[PDB]
Design a protein around this nucleic acid. Structure first.
Length: 409
RNA sequence: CUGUAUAUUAU
């Protein structure tokens, strides 16, 4: 037959007729309004496409919910294809809808129903201004659902977009921190090795770690790098983990005695497998010669506890001696570290851990370890009987006396 | 006499 070439009609000014609304809070156009701001009936799905009012419905709560409740799940439906096309025809419209309090949800629903052909277009649009969408409270979600749902090369492309950016700001950010954590917990290590290269700087590692949000980021990074059990002796993550833990090790005194970093240091000590060497170094370098000081602190006390709880005997022995015979008795009060820690609002908890450690280490394979734990527990029991009358007054002293109750050798 | 953190994105 003959060639026919249908060109779309312009419909320029008639788009702005969607600007007129029932109220000023709602952005839903008045042709689709109850008058109470609720979505009208007989609005179908095709009247949205016919009026170019996808954006106006998506910026209204009821409108967007309607789009979500009635979006076609199957990729081969023409209505799904046309609504997706009207979503991604303009990059700026799509990225403003990603940055909308009510629009973000629609993008997410498209991400829930996506195939690879749609995912490529979405990944390009998101990668255009990924860093600022990560900074946004609404888009941050869209970005995280992308990291969950996109194919691994696409999510790799999004992650590597953030390579030479101000990663310190994005990590301490209220919203982009969860994006970085989702990247770390979801994607293979090659997709975010630049993060490990970033936190090899000690200044970047300290600032981010010492932050209400960054702390969990660095922690999530370590957790994932340590969770390797056994590989093919490739020692890759190992080389990367070392690059990170090194700064952690180099500044463990400052990061242990800190509001948020304390948890990371603990995680290390709690980790055991593949981080036991770094646990040992943190105990050796930040904690020993400073146990009485850090057990009197609000934050570092927990570190001293997790240490006494997970430390190996070879180190526990040193920790115990430092407390029992490591400090010079106070000039005026003639008080030992235990004496000071026994009646401390925080130190009491440490002594209790020390008692636990000694009780659990009596059931050890080595009889000499059992003898040394029994001796340490005897030293604790001796100071507690010396101070028992004052210890009955306290809840902690009741716990301590109950802990040393009917004990073995 | 008890001690620390981790978005409730829907005007």
């Amino acid at each position: 037959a003959v060639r026919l070439i249908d060109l779309e009609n312009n419909a320029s000014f008639s788009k702005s007729l969607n600007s007129t609304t029932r109220s000023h809070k709602c952005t839903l156009p008045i042709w689709a309004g109850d008058g109470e701001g609720n979505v009208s009936d007989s609005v179908t799905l095709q009247d949205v496409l016919a009026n170019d009012a996808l954006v106006e419905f998506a910026t209204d709560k009821n409108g967007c919910r309607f789009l979500q409740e009635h979006y076609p799940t199957e990729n081969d439906n023409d209505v799904h294809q046309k609504l997706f096309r009207k979503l991604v025809e303009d990059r700026a419209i799509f990225l403003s809808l990603c940055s909308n309090m009510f629009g973000n949800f629609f993008v997410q629903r498209v991400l829930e129903c996506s195939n690879t052909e749609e995912q490529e277009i979405l990944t390009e649009h998101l990668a255009t201004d990924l860093y600022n969408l990560c900074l946004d409270k609404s888009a941050c979600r869209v970005i995280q659902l992308a990291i969950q749902k996109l194919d691994v090369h696409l999510a790799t492309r999004l992650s590597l977009e953030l390579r030479d950016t101000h990663l310190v700001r994005l990590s301490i950010d209220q919203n982009g921190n969860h994006v970085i954590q989702k990247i770390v917990k979801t994607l293979p290590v090659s997709s975010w090795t630049f993060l490990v290269d970033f936190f090899a700087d000690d200044d970047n590692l300290i600032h981010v770690c010492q932050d209400k949000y960054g702390c969990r980021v660095i922690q999530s990074t370590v957790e994932t790098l340590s969770t390797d059990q056994y590989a093919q002796c490739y020692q890759h993550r190992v080389i990367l983990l070392r690059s990170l833990m090194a700064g952690v090790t180099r500044n463990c005194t400052q990061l242990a005695s800190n509001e948020f970093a304390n948890y990371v240091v603990q995680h290390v000590i709690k980790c055991g497998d593949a981080l036991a060497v770094y646990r040992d170094i943190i105990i050796e370098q930040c904690l020993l010669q400073n146990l009485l000081s850090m057990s009197q602190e609000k934050y570092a006390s927990h570190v001293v506890e997790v240490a006494f709880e997970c430390a190996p005997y070879r180190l526990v022995a040193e920790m115990m001696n430092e407390i029992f015979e490591g400090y010079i008795p106070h000039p005026d009060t003639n008080r030992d570290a235990l004496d000071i820690l026994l009646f401390h609002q925080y130190g009491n908890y440490v002594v209790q851990q020390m008692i636990q450690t000694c009780v659990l280490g009596q059931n050890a394979r080595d009889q000499k370890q059992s003898e040394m734990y029994g001796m340490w527990l005897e030293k604790i029991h001796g100071r507690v009987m010396r101070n028992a009358h004052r210890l009955e007054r306290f809840s902690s002293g009741k716990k301590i006396i109950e802990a040393l109750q009917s004990m073995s050798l």
